[PDB]
């Protein structure tokens, strides 16, 4: 449906009220079923209207006009629903033509630390709610971890690159508002081993299937066997994978043993039978002689001499029958024994080449989580799985920077302004920053509220890049320590001509060792110009930041030469190498759920700080210090949509506080 699809595109259940709605509409959710369905339709319909034309503001009046009775009956209910949606940035978010120009008279003052997507998203919302907003940004540009390389026609993202599907994605709305060239990524991606030989199709399929079975196993190990603590330490995903692999090797050996153990049991039956047949052949030989000697006595003979020939004859045919029965039994044990030799169990669980290809699939997983599998929480690494968007993953051919730059229009942004200290008290806040170009030039910003969008990497930095006065409480700092901040680098290779298959978007390279599975393990072809993008993931990312760009472009050309041949691979016109861990305004790529952490720490990061009272015995103050960014959004972490949504959330929480609900 259209109304049901709007709820889906807004990440809302169409047929039920959310916790957030229950809080703002307690009268309704606590009351009659019919009023709830009316509420839900008004909500769903208002969303549909916004989603169908997100380039122009949806007013309350415009909403009421396009509602049919009995839903347009209650004008206050429609106004409450519209207002709620606008406040929480479900409608009239991003970049849209405003119908009624913003009032000149501004209420309240907010400093936003960082002009990343989380910052910019919040700033727009707050400004449009009639607050005074200033963003402080350390860099000479907006966008933060959305960073696009540009030299002439060459365009390549060193940061965010992929829209992870449009189904329920708020970047779907943004893509209609901004001109982003979204190009579907073809799932097909061939591998190429150390030498440059494509993995044969049948083998590729076998290792991939084994990877998915190994993951499914870690999940079984986690949820069913409750193997989540080992030696009073949280179990890593890497540890679980080691243990699952070992148990698969352990089974292969156990299988061989049981098979050879049943061969010896058969060989011992045969041995015991052959001994019986050898002893019986001797007794048959002796008894034949006795009969021969008895028959050598020519007639005429007495009856005892006749009886001796007859008795020995009878006895010899009897023993010859036994030997014929045993010889049959021997013949069928020799069939069984030859069949067991024909159908042995598997020699090894995984070949050396298989383990190298499996390491590429682990590298892929280390890329996605931007961390070694030894750091990921077994239980919670995938805790956000139920909220993944539907639809094909897309790239931004424009360069993703087009989004922040668009969001930055009409916003008071101080670039080259590095926040050093954040002060928060019952009466308000001072943010102390310096000029990045000359550290001596000091700036002081006085505000009612501070929105911190500092990356988790920065919040983690010891000794601190940013000092909080008073210091952040133990519950906040403990969350910052616990939570993982990963790393992931990109090598941008700009050529004069396409020497690769244009219909293939990705292709892997398999490393020699486990230790280097992440090193230039994947190549992207998503751009119009001839550009190849190489990922450095896992343990390799951290180490490859000390190695120079020439050596890295070196190792890149080598790998490409091996796949397409020396004559096909020219020298690149332009090369760029990201170093996100070394970057002091990131200190890494994006968050992961570290062993010992959970989704709950993301919620702790989102919780605002309330200062103590100035004079003792003074009433409980209001919250002053708020937090947004990908590390603050439990259901969409380590993403642009997550950052976007975290901003919209804090804009609503801040407006609710300082303008009232």
């Amino acid at each position: 449906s259209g109304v049901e699809g709007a709820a889906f595109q807004s990440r809302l259940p169409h047929d039920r009220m959310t916790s957030q709605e229950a809080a703002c509409f307690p009268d309704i959710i606590s009351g009659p079923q019919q009023t709830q369905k009316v509420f839900l339709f008004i909500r769903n319909r208002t969303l549909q209207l916004w989603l169908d034309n997100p380039k122009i503001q949806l007013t309350f009046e415009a909403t009421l006009q396009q509602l049919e009775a009995p839903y347009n009956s209650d004008t206050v209910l429609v106004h409450r629903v519209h207002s709620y949606l606008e406040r929480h940035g479900l409608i009239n978010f991003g970049i849209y033509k405003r119908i009624k120009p913003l009032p000149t008279k501004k209420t309240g003052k907010v400093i936003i630390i960082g002009s990343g997507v989380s910052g910019l998203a919040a700033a727009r919302q707050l400004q449009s709610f009639g607050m005074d907003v200033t963003l402080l940004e350390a860099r000479d540009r907006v966008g933060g971890r959305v960073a696009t390389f540009r030299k002439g026609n060459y365009v390549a993202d060193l940061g965010a690159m992929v829209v992870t599907g449009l189904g329920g994605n708020p970047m779907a709305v943004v893509s209609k508002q901004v001109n982003m060239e979204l190009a579907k990524i073809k799932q097909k991606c061939p591998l190429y081993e150390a030498n440059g030989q494509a993995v044969p199709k049948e083998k590729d399929e076998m290792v991939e299937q084994e990877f998915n079975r190994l993951l499914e196993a870690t999940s079984y190990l986690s949820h069913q066997l409750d193997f989540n603590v080992l030696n009073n330490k949280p179990v890593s995903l890497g540890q679980a994978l080691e243990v699952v692999i070992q148990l698969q090797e352990k089974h292969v050996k156990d299988e061989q043993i049981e098979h050879w153990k049943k061969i010896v049991k058969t060989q011992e039956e045969l041995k015991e039978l052959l001994n019986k047949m050898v002893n019986l052949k001797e007794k048959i030989k002796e008894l034949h002689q006795q009969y021969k000697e008895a028959s050598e006595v020519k007639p005429p003979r007495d009856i005892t001499a006749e009886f001796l020939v007859k008795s020995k004859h009878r006895d010899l045919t009897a023993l010859c029958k036994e030997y014929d029965e045993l010889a049959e039994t021997q013949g069928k044990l020799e069939e069984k024994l030859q069949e067991l030799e024909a159908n042995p169990p598997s020699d090894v669980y995984l070949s050396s080449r298989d383990r190298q290809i499996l390491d590429w699939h682990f590298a892929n997983l280390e890329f996605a989580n931007a961390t070694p599998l030894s750091t990921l929480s077994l239980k919670h690494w995938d805790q956000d799985d139920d909220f993944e968007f539907t639809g094909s993953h897309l790239t931004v051919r424009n360069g993703y920077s087009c989004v922040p730059v668009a969001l930055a229009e009409g916003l008071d942004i101080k670039l080259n302004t590095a926040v050093r200290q954040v002060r928060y008290t019952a009466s308000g806040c001072e943010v102390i920053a310096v000029n990045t170009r000359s550290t001596s030039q000091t700036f002081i910003y006085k505000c009612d509220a501070v929105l911190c969008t500092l990356p988790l990497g920065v919040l983690k930095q010891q000794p601190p890049a940013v000092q909080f006065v008073p210091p952040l409480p133990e519950w906040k700092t403990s969350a910052v320590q616990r939570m993982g901040f990963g790393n992931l680098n990109k090598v941008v290779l700009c050529f004069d001509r396409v020497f690769w298959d244009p219909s293939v978007n990705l292709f892997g390279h398999v490393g020699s060792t486990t230790a280097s599975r992440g090193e230039l393990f994947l190549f992207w072809n998503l751009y119009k110009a001839p550009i190849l993008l190489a990922l450095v993931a896992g343990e390799a990312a951290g180490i490859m930041e000390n190695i120079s760009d020439d050596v890295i472009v070196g190792r890149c050309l080598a790998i490409l030469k091996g796949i397409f041949g020396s004559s096909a691979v020219p020298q690149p016109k332009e090369t760029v190498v990201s170093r996100w861990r070394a970057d002091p305004w990131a200190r890494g790529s994006y968050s992961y759920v570290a062993a010992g952490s959970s989704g709950n720490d993301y919620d702790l990061m989102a919780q605002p700080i309330t200062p103590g009272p100035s004079i003792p015995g003074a009433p409980q103050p209001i919250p002053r210090l708020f937090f947004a960014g990908e590390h603050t959004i439990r259901n969409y972490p380590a993403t642009v949509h997550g950052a976007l949504l975290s901003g919209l959330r804090e804009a609503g929480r801040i407006a609710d506080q300082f303008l009232g609900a």
């Binding site: 890329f367 996605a368 968007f389």
Partner: peptide, 9 residues
């Protein structure tokens, strides 16, 4: 996160 994985199946 998981969603970033290539050829996820």
């Amino acid at each position: 996160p998981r969603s970033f994985l290539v050829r996820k199946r």
